[model samples]
Target: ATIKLASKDNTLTIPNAYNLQARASVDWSGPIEELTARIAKAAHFRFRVLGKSPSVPVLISISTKDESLAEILRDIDYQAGKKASIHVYPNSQVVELRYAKI
Candidate 1:
């Protein structure tokens, strides 16, 4: 195998191990803001919550045996559903949760 070195204008940023390997679970009911905080803590990732919080509360009960932090974030976004969405900035090493219009 030949390993050639090439120079490019664009740079590749490796993903954080914490965001890829750290695992945590949640089994509680509360506001989306709180939920976001808990997930960030559990997943061991820094988060920047965007948008507004829903007047209604979310009942999140997730179980992760060996799920990656990314997977956990995806799961919550799915559980939260239309109410919100999650975005991971690998370069910035930050996760953002944007709530839907209420």
Candidate 2:
């Protein structure tokens, strides 16, 4: 799914330097239901449950104009006891949000 972004000027792209080391984490053993509910309410973009089992982490992808929005979402994930990684790219098209689990 894709969403319209407000702007993209001066926005940071997915830096290759950080891509290899980046990681996404979520509290799987804890109250995931509550956490997911909270995330659903707070997240600005689309989030997907890539994993069927309880231990696997969730994959959330969002479209934003700048890095700050991405940081905000990441912070929300962090507060929810989930480690979040970011991948910023040019949203030249209206439909730019793409997500997949590896």
Candidate 3:
């Protein structure tokens, strides 16, 4: 299924494997691939990297007591300057990232 996001506030479709009741947090300061890997681990799913790489490092630090996986991703995208396109797919319990299309 497709999820809608706009840099900030919006409902997102998460995988059934994702713990809806769990809080999501991130403190990453590295490349897109590395950060997403951690997110996948927290969300209990895998992510696929698509498109060309920006090859630039980014910083994302968030400590949330109440947030979903999608929310965490949105924050990461925001920190990345909206260039890192994120797509969360519940269909196969996978998230995909397409970069450098800003």
Model 2 lDDT, residue 38, Cα: 38
Candidate 1: regions farther than 4 A off? 1-18, 25-32, 41-44
Clashes of each: 0, 1, 0
Residue 98 lDDT (model 3):
65
Candidate 2 residue pairs that clash = 25-83
Quote the positional error of residue 28 for candidate 1 in Å.
4.6
Residue 92 miss distance in model 3 (angstroms): 1.4
Go through the candidates in order and give each one's C-alpha lDDT: 0.55, 0.33, 0.58
Model 2 TM-score (2 dp) = 0.24
Top candidate, metric lDDT: 3
How would you encode candidate 3's per-residue C-alpha lDDT over 4-87 as one tens digit per residue? 111443245332334423454444355656766676666666777776776555555655555666666666666766566666
lDDT tens digits, residue span 66-97, model 2: 43333434433444332332333323211111
- Candidate 3: pairs in clash: none
Q: Estimate each model's TM-score.
A: 0.64, 0.24, 0.63
lDDT of 1 by residue, 50-91 (tens): 777666755455554455555555666667777776676675
Off by over 4 Å in 3: 1-21
Better of 2 and 3 by TM-score: 3
In lDDT terms, how accurate is model 1? 0.55
